[PDB]
Amino acid sequence: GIDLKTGIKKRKVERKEPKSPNPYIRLLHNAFKVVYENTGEDFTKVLTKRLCLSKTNRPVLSVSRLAHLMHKREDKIAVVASTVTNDERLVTIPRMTICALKFSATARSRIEKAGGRCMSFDELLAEKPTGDNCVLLQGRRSCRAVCKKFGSPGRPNSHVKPKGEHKGRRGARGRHSW
Amino acid sequence: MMQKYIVYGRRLPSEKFPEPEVFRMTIYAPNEIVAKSRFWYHLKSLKKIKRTHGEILDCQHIEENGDFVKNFGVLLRYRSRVGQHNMYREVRETTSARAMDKVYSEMAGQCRARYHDIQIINVKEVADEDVRREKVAMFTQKGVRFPHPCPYVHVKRAARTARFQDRAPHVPQ
Amino acid sequence: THSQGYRCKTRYCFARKFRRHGMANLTTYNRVYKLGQYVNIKVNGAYHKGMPHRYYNGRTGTIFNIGPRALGVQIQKRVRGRIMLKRINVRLEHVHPSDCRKNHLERVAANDAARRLAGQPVPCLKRQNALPRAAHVVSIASAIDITPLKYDG
Amino acid sequence: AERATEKEKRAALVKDHAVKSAQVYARYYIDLVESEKKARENALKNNQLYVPDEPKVYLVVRIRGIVGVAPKVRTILSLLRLRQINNAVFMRCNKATLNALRIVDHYVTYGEPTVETIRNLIYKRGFAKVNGQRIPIVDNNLIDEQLSKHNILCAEDLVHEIFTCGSSFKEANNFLWPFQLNSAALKDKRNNFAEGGDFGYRGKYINEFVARMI
Amino acid sequence: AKLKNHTSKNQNRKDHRNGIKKPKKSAYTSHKGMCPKYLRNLRRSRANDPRQSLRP
RNA sequence: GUGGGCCCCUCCUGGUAAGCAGGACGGGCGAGGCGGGACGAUCCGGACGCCGGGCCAGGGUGCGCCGCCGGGGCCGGAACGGCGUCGGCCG
Ligand SMILES: [K+]
Ligand SMILES: [K+]
Ligand SMILES: [K+]
Ligand SMILES: [K+]
Ligand SMILES: [K+]
Ligand SMILES: [Mg+2]
Ligand SMILES: [Mg+2]
Ligand SMILES: [Mg+2]
Ligand SMILES: [Mg+2]
Ligand SMILES: [Mg+2]
Ligand SMILES: [Mg+2]
């Protein structure tokens, strides 16, 4: 026998490959995984992991959030491994270069009409595979409504709302309401 | 298997008592690791110096010449199931360590006392006239003769490979 | 147990020490306390207001609040597989300034002091767990000869 | 390429270092067991003793298995890297290590190794930990690549550092995987060596105990 | 019939299996329970420091 | 899924006691093969993929039944009795 329990923890499971059946996702992930193994750049390593994520870990990005984040560094390439949607509450857009997995039809029309460019990750792969003058960006992973009900509403330090409809008063008017 | 050792020891020196006293003992043990342990068993009782608080300066091993047969007198104390006792024993052997082998086997056999139950107080040579035990004294004489005390032992031993024979052998005496 | 009130099982720990009854000396109120300081909790059994529960006697914590009359102390407390950070409010008679980091401030001051002095080579400033002794000579001119003694009963 | 030139030159530089250090260390080992002799002798002309230095390294062997161990015993044994019943390690001596080892005495036996015992263990049972892998130690090319920052370049530098308990003992000692020795010969596994048993402190008698297990 | 009342025999081993957790790093600095008269003056001081103020 | 547990070592409480009943740190059986304790869920060793070689823990070595010789002694259970035998201490 051998004692391999004390001071040793249980191993970990993480996504090491995309589970999408889309052939365009497999082709791109397999390609950027190759560039990492021949470059050792940590930009191509973070980007290879973003392409394995599960679509609740890949929230969207709006143009107005990009226009805000890319301010004062407007000569750089925003890189987003998700969809770029449109924000109609912003009346005027600036000129910028964005590379994304997918563009909405209305967001593409606005980006181009300002003088910007809409790149794809295979355009990025050919011209800038190691991320020179590129910035990686993502949206708010905790914006989902589902992640707002996690926990124990009813416990005195919760700050979470219950799930159904509750029409009573008992425990719902603060402490000393039970 | 017993061996004679001389051990030196002393309390660790401090500010109140620079240059503490040195204590030496003669020990009989099967090796150097048992002997140093037995030195700390006595220095803890007689002088109240635990092993944590002192250091051992030497474990001298002494080899004795044999070649002649002398008497030894051992003053010891041992423990039984009802208390503690004193006892004097005499033996004839060729070196002091061999005389302590003989003592430990007689204690183990007639008193059922083991090595760590026994404390040796004294071990000295005893001149022929001064002996006090009958068994030893018989052989401290001129011209002692006896016939062989067990000649059957020779014949049986040969009969362990010579398992079958044609006559029952004799025992010459 | 069968009975578990707030001051149960307190017959000895809340009692006063021999010939140490009466009012606390006035250093209890002239000490200055600061945010972030370490303190010990020791219950004085003659002062009944702001007196912490018996669990907290003999623990060490850190000040998080300085109030007009009482101090706020944070205690790490183990509960059944996790540690909890507990916050309590205790009056001055049950708090004493703690020296748990006294040894560490003396060493940090001593290393920067002995660096300033340079002894041209910098001395080794790491603490050393006691090493085995080195080789040396000792005299045996005067040596005592002991032996086991006889049983006396 | 330039890789084959540097690897050609480097090994050559390491090899001539191996013939320099071998002869000097052989000189050192003869000289110790001499200087003590002249110092014990100067002791005799006076009424004086010579008390030498205590051990600085121990060799520790595990002699009991894994069924039924208590929690504080099994944590101490894992920090010593003694996870299997016949494994052996080298170990530094100070009050931190000595007081932990006395807690697990009935599981272990230990003492002071010679430079001959150290040499046979490394040359015959020596493997290396490299990126978490157990790699056979067969030549000076692997001791240089891993330990050159601490000025250990050949097998006889590793032996010298372990025997003298020098400046880089921690890194020299952890480079070795724990020794995987053959099964031991015991009198009485459940008794201390000073009662005729097998466990605990046994001094210089550790050298013939492991001799048959290497 | 009667069944067992109480034991804690296996409970220290269950308590240790996932390690003994530690409280969040941010619980050590929670404002909950501090003097309000101190927390008021803390906000006021920063709002009027141009290096710290976050007013538009 | 579980919320009938039980046993060992040390430490305890009720009871004349119990293979009785109730608590405590650590370990085990439960849910742990293999060897040994003649025989046993828990004792002594040792914790397990399928093989070949070597070394040997615990217990042992007249024949059943794998494996031994040499050397020194002696020859279930209470109060209480013994000029059985060998060895001591005090007078
Ligand atoms: K709910
Ligand atoms: K509690
Ligand atoms: K009764
Ligand atoms: K088990
Ligand atoms: K009798
Ligand atoms: Mg192994
Ligand atoms: Mg836990
Ligand atoms: Mg029962
Ligand atoms: Mg069951
Ligand atoms: Mg059987
Ligand atoms: Mg047979």
Side-chain angles (χ1 to χ4, degrees), chain B residues 88-90 130-138:
Chain B
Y88 183 78
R89 304 207 66 97
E90 304 196 2
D130 286 350
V131 171
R132 316 137 49 180
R133 298 272 188 251
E134 222 276 340
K135 214 180 284 297
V136 173
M138 280 150 41

Side-chain angles (χ1 to χ4, degrees), chain D residues 99-136:
Chain D
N99 279 15
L101 167 80
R102 183 171 62 216
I103 285 178
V104 299
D105 260 7
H106 60 289
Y107 267 78
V108 136
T109 189
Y110 54 100
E112 302 112 35
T114 65
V115 55
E116 305 89 62
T117 305
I118 289 154
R119 179 175 288 113
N120 301 22
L121 277 180
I122 292 177
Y123 283 55
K124 293 194 216 174
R125 298 273 170 172
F127 291 68
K129 186 169 68 166
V130 179
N131 193 31
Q133 327 282 314
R134 194 181 165 245
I135 310 296

Side-chain angles (χ1 to χ4, degrees), chain E residues 2 4 6-9 11 15-18 20 23 25 30-32 35 39 45-46 48 53-54 56:
Chain E
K2 305 163 77 175
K4 197 164 170 63
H6 169 66
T7 181
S8 57
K9 147 136 295 141
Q11 305 309 310
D15 286 337
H16 273 277
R17 246 186 281 179
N18 288 306
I20 301 283
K25 298 300 283 200
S30 167
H31 278 332
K32 208 186 187 194
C35 184
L39 295 173
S45 95
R46 292 175 155 171
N48 310 272
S53 160
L54 244 77

Side-chain angles (χ1 to χ4, degrees), chain A residues 5-49:
Chain A
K5 304 186 182 197
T6 172
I8 290 177
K9 301 197 176 84
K10 173 177 163 165
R11 72 180 177 263
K12 303 186 136 298
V13 57
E14 57 165 293
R15 279 201 178 182
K16 293 142 187 177
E17 171 221 353
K19 63 136 48 68
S20 155
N22 194 338
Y24 183 71
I25 297 305
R26 309 304 276 258
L27 293 189
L28 282 172
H29 163 268
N30 253 321
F32 276 104
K33 174 183 210 306
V34 163
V35 155
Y36 174 71
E37 306 175 293
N38 306 333
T39 315
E41 272 277 358
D42 71 82
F43 173 91
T44 321
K45 187 202 182 184
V46 180
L47 179 57
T48 308
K49 180 73 169 59

